[PDB]
Amino acid sequence: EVQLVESGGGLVKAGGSLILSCGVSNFRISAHTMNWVRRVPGGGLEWVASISTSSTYRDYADAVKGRFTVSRDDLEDFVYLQMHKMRVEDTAIYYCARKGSDRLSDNDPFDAWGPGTVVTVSPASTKGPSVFPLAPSGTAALGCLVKDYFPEPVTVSWNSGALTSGVHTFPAVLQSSGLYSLSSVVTVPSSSLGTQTYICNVNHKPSNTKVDKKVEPK
Amino acid sequence: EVQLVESGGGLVKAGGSLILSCGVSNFRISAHTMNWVRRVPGGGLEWVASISTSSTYRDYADAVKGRFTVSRDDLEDFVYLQMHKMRVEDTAIYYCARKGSDRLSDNDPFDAWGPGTVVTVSPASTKGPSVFPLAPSGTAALGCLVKDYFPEPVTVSWNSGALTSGVHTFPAVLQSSGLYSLSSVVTVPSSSLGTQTYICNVNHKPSNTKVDKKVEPK
Amino acid sequence: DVVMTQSPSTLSASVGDTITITCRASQSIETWLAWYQQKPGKAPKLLIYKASTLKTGVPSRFSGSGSGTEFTLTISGLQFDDFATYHCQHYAGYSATFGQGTRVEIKRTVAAPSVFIFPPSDEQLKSGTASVVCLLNNFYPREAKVQWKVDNALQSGNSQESVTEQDSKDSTYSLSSTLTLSKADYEKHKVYACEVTHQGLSSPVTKSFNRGE
Amino acid sequence: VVMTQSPSTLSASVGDTITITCRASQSIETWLAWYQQKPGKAPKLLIYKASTLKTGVPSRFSGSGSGTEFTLTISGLQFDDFATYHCQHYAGYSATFGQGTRVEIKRTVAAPSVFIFPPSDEQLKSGTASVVCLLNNFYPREAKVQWKVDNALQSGNSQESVTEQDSKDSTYSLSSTLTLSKADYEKHKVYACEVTHQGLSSPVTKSFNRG
Ligand SMILES: *[C@@H]1O[C@H](CO)[C@@H](O[C@@H]2O[C@H](CO)[C@@H](O[C@@H]3O[C@H](CO[C@H]4O[C@H](CO[C@H]5O[C@H](CO)[C@@H](O)[C@H](O)[C@@H]5O[C@H]5O[C@H](CO)[C@@H](O)[C@H](O)[C@@H]5O)[C@@H](O)[C@H](O[C@@H]5O[C@H](CO)[C@@H](O)[C@H](O)[C@@H]5O)[C@@H]4O)[C@@H](O)[C@H](O[C@@H]4O[C@H](CO)[C@@H](O)[C@H](O)[C@@H]4O)[C@@H]3O)[C@H](O)[C@H]2NC(C)=O)[C@H](O)[C@H]1NC(C)=O
Numbered sequence: 001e002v003q004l005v006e007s008g009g010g011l012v013k014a015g016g017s018l019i020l021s022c023g024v025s026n027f028r029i030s031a032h033t034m035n036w037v038r039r040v041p042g043g044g045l046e047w048v049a050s051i052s053t054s055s056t057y058r059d060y061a062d063a064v065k066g067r068f069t070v071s072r073d074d075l076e077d078f079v080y081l082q083m084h085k086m087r088v089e090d091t092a093i094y095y096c097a098r099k100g101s102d103r104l105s106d107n108d109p110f111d112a113w114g115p116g117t118v119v120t121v122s123p124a125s126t127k128g129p130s131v132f133p134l135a136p137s138g139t140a141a142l143g144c145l146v147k148d149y150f151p152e153p154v155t156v157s158w159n160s161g162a163l164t165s166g167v168h169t170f171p172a173v174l175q176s177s178g179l180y181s182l183s184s185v186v187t188v189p190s191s192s193l194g195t196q197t198y199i200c201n202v203n204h205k206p207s208n209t210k211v212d213k214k215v216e217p218k
Numbered sequence: 219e220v221q222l223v224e225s226g227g228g229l230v231k232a233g234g235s236l237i238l239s240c241g242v243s244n245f246r247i248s249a250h251t252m253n254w255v256r257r258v259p260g261g262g263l264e265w266v267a268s269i270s271t272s273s274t275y276r277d278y279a280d281a282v283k284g285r286f287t288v289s290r291d292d293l294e295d296f297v298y299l300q301m302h303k304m305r306v307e308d309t310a311i312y313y314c315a316r317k318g319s320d321r322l323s324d325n326d327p328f329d330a331w332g333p334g335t336v337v338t339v340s341p342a343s344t345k346g347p348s349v350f351p352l353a354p355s356g357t358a359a360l361g362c363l364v365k366d367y368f369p370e371p372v373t374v375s376w377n378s379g380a381l382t383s384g385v386h387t388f389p390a391v392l393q394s395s396g397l398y399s400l401s402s403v404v405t406v407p408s409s410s411l412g413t414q415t416y417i418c419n420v421n422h423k424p425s426n427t428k429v430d431k432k433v434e435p436k
Numbered sequence: 437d438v439v440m441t442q443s444p445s446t447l448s449a450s451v452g453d454t455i456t457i458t459c460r461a462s463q464s465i466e467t468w469l470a471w472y473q474q475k476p477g478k479a480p481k482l483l484i485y486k487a488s489t490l491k492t493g494v495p496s497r498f499s500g501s502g503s504g505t506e507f508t509l510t511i512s513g514l515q516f517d518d519f520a521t522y523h524c525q526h527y528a529g530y531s532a533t534f535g536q537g538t539r540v541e542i543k544r545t546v547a548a549p550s551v552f553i554f555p556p557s558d559e560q561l562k563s564g565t566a567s568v569v570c571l572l573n574n575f576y577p578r579e580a581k582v583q584w585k586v587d588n589a590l591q592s593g594n595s596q597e598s599v600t601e602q603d604s605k606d607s608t609y610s611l612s613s614t615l616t617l618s619k620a621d622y623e624k625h626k627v628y629a630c631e632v633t634h635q636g637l638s639s640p641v642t643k644s645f646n647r648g649e
Numbered sequence: 650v651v652m653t654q655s656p657s658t659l660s661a662s663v664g665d666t667i668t669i670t671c672r673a674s675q676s677i678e679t680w681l682a683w684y685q686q687k688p689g690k691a692p693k694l695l696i697y698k699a700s701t702l703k704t705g706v707p708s709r710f711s712g713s714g715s716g717t718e719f720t721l722t723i724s725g726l727q728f729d730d731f732a733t734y735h736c737q738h739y740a741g742y743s744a745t746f747g748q749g750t751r752v753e754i755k756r757t758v759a760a761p762s763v764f765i766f767p768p769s770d771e772q773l774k775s776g777t778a779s780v781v782c783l784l785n786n787f788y789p790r791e792a793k794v795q796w797k798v799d800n801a802l803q804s805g806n807s808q809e810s811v812t813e814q815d816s817k818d819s820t821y822s823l824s825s826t827l828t829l830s831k832a833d834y835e836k837h838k839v840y841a842c843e844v845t846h847q848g849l850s851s852p853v854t855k856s857f858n859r860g
């Protein structure tokens with residue numbers, strides 16, 4: 001028996017990027033042309049890429065040609081597949097199989113395969129923010145809490161840029177959901193809380209989302 | 219300018235695996251020793267891997283030695299870093315750095331750096347499920363419902379193996395949360411809904427989180 | 437460039453049946469075909485490494501043929517082991533292409549789905565998530581369609597389906613579909629229904645419930 | 650090889666001449682380099698071979714030392730020079746780094762003004778509660794925020810973010826967000842934020858009662 005061991009596969013976002021790799025055991029890849037194959041949710045096998053013995057010639061299936069790059073390491077026995085700007089239909093199990101035979105030739109089938117690794121390309125390429133008020137309970141503090149937006153960045157202004165003094169817009173934090181969240185605050189005179197209107201202008205160019213939120217006492 | 223661009227960042231789980239890569243422009247990599255570096259939570263740097271010209275030598279810091287693997291592929295100008303068995307202290311920005319000078323020598327600093335890509339290792343190495351009843355409305359169907367776990371499997375049985383005819387447990391689905399869900403069901407005589415107490419004895423075997431739930435009419 | 441025209445897309449049979457399958461190349465190749473088995477979610481296994489040319493260690497029940505354009509695979513009395521997918525491959529020096537695999541399956545008469553709908557448990561709902569489950573308990577063949585309607589509004593994009601493979605005692609397929617909604621959105625509407633069509637049904641089947649009733 | 654760098658934070662005025670020291674656990678000859686790093690940016694090389702200034706690096710940066718003691722001197726701090734800095738031992742096919750030094754603008758100690766914000770009704774109706782504690786205009790940068798719900802120390806359910814030094818008053822500000830589902834937030838009443846900081850003689854707590 002001989003073995004191949006795919007790694008790196010998981011959840012992805014459309015127009016995002018991932019890299020797969022395949023290790024091996026009981027054999028050396030330095031003799032073999034190495035191939036990537038996938039099984040789509042529709043159940044059919046698609047060939048994806050190959051790279052020759054001696055790393056000479058690299059070839060691709062026409063759905064991934066130009067978008068993907070195949071790579072190899074003949075010494076530690078690893079193969080790689082960069083997947084730049086993935087499509088929703090790049091969702092598949094991705095297998096790494098060796099072109100091979102007991103005696104090798106200038107043309108053979110795939111005589112050993114690894115168990116395959118799942119890749120899912122979720123269709124949400126950009127997510128637009130939610131915006132929530134940070135309500136002011138001398139000097140008072142108020143703000144806006146931008147949340148659940150992808151990718152960065154978000155820009156925030158206050159009163160269309162007329163209110164700049166005392167404003168702090170914080171660096172975003174990356175949540176364990178894979179989505180970003182930032183807060184923008186401003187300190188102002190407590191006396192102005194009844195008359196002055198405070199509006200934070202949240203712009204998210206990647207989703208083409210603009211939100212104007214008025215922040216007022218509860 | 220010299221151009222470097224990392225790819226393959228994002229979220230990972232403790233005990234999990236990832237692969238980084240970096241590609242370049244305005245230079246060919248083959249004349250350079252190439253490196254990986256990270257910025258750990260204290261704002262300090264750590265060096266992570268170095269691969270020499272012609273892949274002659276590969277050296278690593280003790281924290282990542284035997285866990286990680288660097289590789290390079292000069293004929294397309296790419297460098298790779300596998301990260302098997304990631305741990306929470308590997309949470310950092312990662313960068314692909316060129317060892318170099320205006321005139322290259324036998325030992326040099328790191329001159330050209332890519333903009334970096336973030337890697338986060340979340341401590342959720344075995345996230346335990348949430349388990350919920352599917353309540354019966356001549357033949358009735360009942361069941362149990364598993365959500366939000368990693369890794370697989372979640373295992374299910376009916377009344378500790380006393381019930382087996384008409385039992386089905388479905389293949390898991392990968393949610394947009396990056397966590398699994400499934401359901402288990404059984405069909406039984408409607409007359410027995412009053413007398414027989416159906417229960418599902420479950421386990422998330424990775425975390426060894428043993429759960430039970432009685433299923434009865436609502 | 438070559439495309440493979442494999443036929444049928446699904447073959448129905450039973451233990452001891454001799455079966456034949458056929459891959460037809462869209463333009464001629466020099467007998468460069470090979471054939472694989474694939475069990476669900478597994479790696480494929482190579483059976484035949486050139487047309488009619490069985491790989492060593494493969495069970496003697498397997499066979500095939502090739503004519504430079506038309507090709508076959510044949511199995512000499514199926515075992516319970518053989519009820520998996522089969523794929524043809526055309527392999528060139530630095531590329532390959534495969535047929536849309538012939539799924540081999542255990543045959544029976546058509547059987548319509550018993551449909552059941554489950555509301556979310558109160559215990560799930562208090563946590564803030566509502567998972568509504570639709571169960572097609574047993575049917576044959578595999579191909580079925582389920583759609584969700586909330587307040588008679590056809591839903592789109594908020595459900596995940598999985599099918600169990602053939603049952604060990606009756607060889608039927610089964611499907612479950614999970615409609616996912618936050619507690620907020622779920623309490624916004626009353627009726628939650630699933631509508632099913634299948635080979636055995638003369639009209640669509642709908643199961644529904646009213647939230648809170 | 651192991652390295653140490655001191656001080657971990659260096660506070661100075663514009664125009665000052667400052668020194669940052671690196672000490673190696675064993676002799677590394679002159680095989681050491683220095684790097685400037687801005688927030689959110691990859692490090693830029695300043696000096697190598699201990700003293701060799703990189704082509705295009707301003708002359709105000711210099712380095713000296715051999716064996717186990719190395720120094721980076723910045724002679725006349727400009728606003729661009731207030732950054733992270735790191736000593737780096739380099740060898741034919743490897744490297745290692747010290748812990749780094751952060752250079753900031755010095756000002757008097759300023760205690761944070763603390764504010765706590767409960768979740769908005771809108772967000773709360775969606776099923777998620779994000780309270781936000783704000784530490785406004787403090788100096789130096791080290792501050793600690795602890796969340797307590799019904800006097801229960803929270804852990805693992807909050808994230809923090811800190812601004813860079815304010816261009817006008819040289820202070821920092823910090824926001825901490827404690828995130829909880831609607832199911833978990835309605836369980837407990839009081840939500841507090843305990844702040845400690847060099848400018849506070851005792852910790853300051855801001856709190857609210859749910860509802
Ligand atoms: C004078 O004559 C000599 C020959 O006598 C000429 O030299 C030859 O020049 C050819 C044309 O430039 C080159 O052919 C091209 O090569 C590339 C890469 O080929 C790689 O694979 C070769 C085969 O190795 C296989 O097969 C053998 C058995 O035959 C096995 O032992 C081996 O383990 C390996 O098996 C694996 O791969 C198979 C598929 O390849 C699988 O079927 C197996 O199961 C298994 O997985 C190998 O020998 C080559 O060796 C290297 O060659 C490099 C130079 O090319 C050299 O740098 C290096 O040091 C090695 O010696 C390679 O590793 C193919 O991809 C090309 O394919 C064509 O590409 C076209 C597009 O570009 C396309 O249109 C067309 O359809 C084809 O796909 C092509 O075959 C020869 O490699 C080269 N040979 C040597 C020894 O140098 C010389 O050029 C000529 N000069 C003049 C002026 O006339």
Ligand SMILES: *[C@@H]1O[C@H](CO)[C@@H](O[C@@H]2O[C@H](CO)[C@@H](O[C@@H]3O[C@H](CO[C@@H]4O[C@H](CO)[C@@H](O)[C@H](O)[C@@H]4O)[C@@H](O)[C@H](O[C@H]4O[C@H](CO)[C@@H](O)[C@H](O)[C@@H]4O)[C@@H]3O)[C@H](O)[C@H]2NC(C)=O)[C@H](O)[C@H]1NC(C)=O
Nearest residue numbers: 249250251270271272274317318322323324325326741742
């Ligand atoms: C005939 O055969 C002889 C012996 O086999 C060959 O001599 C060897 O040649 C190779 C290639 O020229 C040498 O490797 C390179 O040596 C460079 C200089 O020598 C080193 O100096 C340092 C001190 O500065 C010493 O510490 C070393 O021990 C060596 O003496 C060296 O700079 C170079 O570095 C490599 O890696 C760096 C990484 O960045 C690259 O930048 C650099 O370009 C290069 O790739 C190599 O190590 C080897 O040292 C020679 N051996 C000796 C001394 O005999 C002849 O070259 C052969 N001639 C023919 C006809 O081919």
Ligand SMILES: *[C@@H]1O[C@H](CO)[C@@H](O[C@@H]2O[C@H](CO)[C@@H](O[C@@H]3O[C@H](CO[C@H]4O[C@H](CO)[C@@H](O)[C@H](O)[C@@H]4O)[C@@H](O)[C@H](O[C@H]4O[C@H](CO)[C@@H](O)[C@H](O)[C@@H]4O)[C@@H]3O)[C@H](O)[C@H]2NC(C)=O)[C@H](O)[C@H]1NC(C)=O
Nearest residue numbers: 026027028030074075076077269272273274275276277288
């Ligand atoms: C003449 O032709 C022969 C083949 O016919 C070449 O021999 C091969 O040479 C390579 C490169 O030196 C060898 O690859 C090395 O293998 C090491 C492990 O070898 C043992 O274990 C393996 C299984 O794991 C067995 O197959 C093998 O027989 C041994 O028992 C690896 O650890 C090496 O990796 C290290 O070195 C490289 C480069 O320095 C680094 O990039 C790696 O990170 C790592 O540090 C290396 O991959 C190969 O094993 C040899 N094959 C055989 C059959 O012996 C000759 O090299 C060639 N002559 C010349 C001068 O090129």
